[PDB]
Write a protein that binds this ligand. Sequence first.
Ligand SMILES: COc1ccc2[nH]cc(CCN)c2c1
Ligand SMILES: [Ca+2]
Length: 223
Amino acid sequence: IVGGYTCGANTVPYQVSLNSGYHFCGGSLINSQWVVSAAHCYKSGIQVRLGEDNINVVEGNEQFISASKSIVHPSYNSNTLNNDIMLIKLKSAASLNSRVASISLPTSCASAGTQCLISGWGNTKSSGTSYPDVLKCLKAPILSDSSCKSAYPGQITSNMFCAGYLEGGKDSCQGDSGGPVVCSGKLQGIVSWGSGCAQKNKPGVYTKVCNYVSWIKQTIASN
Ligand SMILES: COc1ccc2[nH]cc(CCN)c2c1
Ligand SMILES: [Ca+2]
């Protein structure tokens, strides 16, 4: 997260870190046994880390639970990042509390202008590299479909939205991948892609979760 703020320990209780020996992606806890992330975060050997603030220090609220199964969206296209969503089933249910909590799926798609919270442990610079150890937060609005399509001609599908600032300076970045965009207490987006981070006229692009609720619910019910 470039141009954000330090969230504060366990203020974003649905945020997960996907760990394969190191943090490599975020995700969101949607019930005691399931995480949603980005399909581009797929790999085998995932441990889900819940209750994290500092990803390098054991602070006492963590739960470390191995993935049993990963399900990439059947229509995920790694070239276009259309359908950039994946579900991860935990080996055992998480213990839910004020610091480890699920985030509700949306019943409705959020409109342009809605303010959202984006969180992650990604890079905090738009040029060069500095990785924070504690969770960073950014408040950003959903942009109009027309602004989003004007910024990324020929690349925005109906399964994507833009959020952020056309001015630049505030955005999700490398290592924020898979993390949540929460608007009005519902999961509306997944950190998916962009052209660099925090560049002028290049907002972040997010998976439009409201289009996937039926797939999520059906998949969870049968796995
Ligand atoms: C440094 O460039 C990258 C590299 C990989 C990335 N994944 C997701 C994003 C978000 C951009 N908002 C991103 C940016
Ligand atoms: Ca920790």
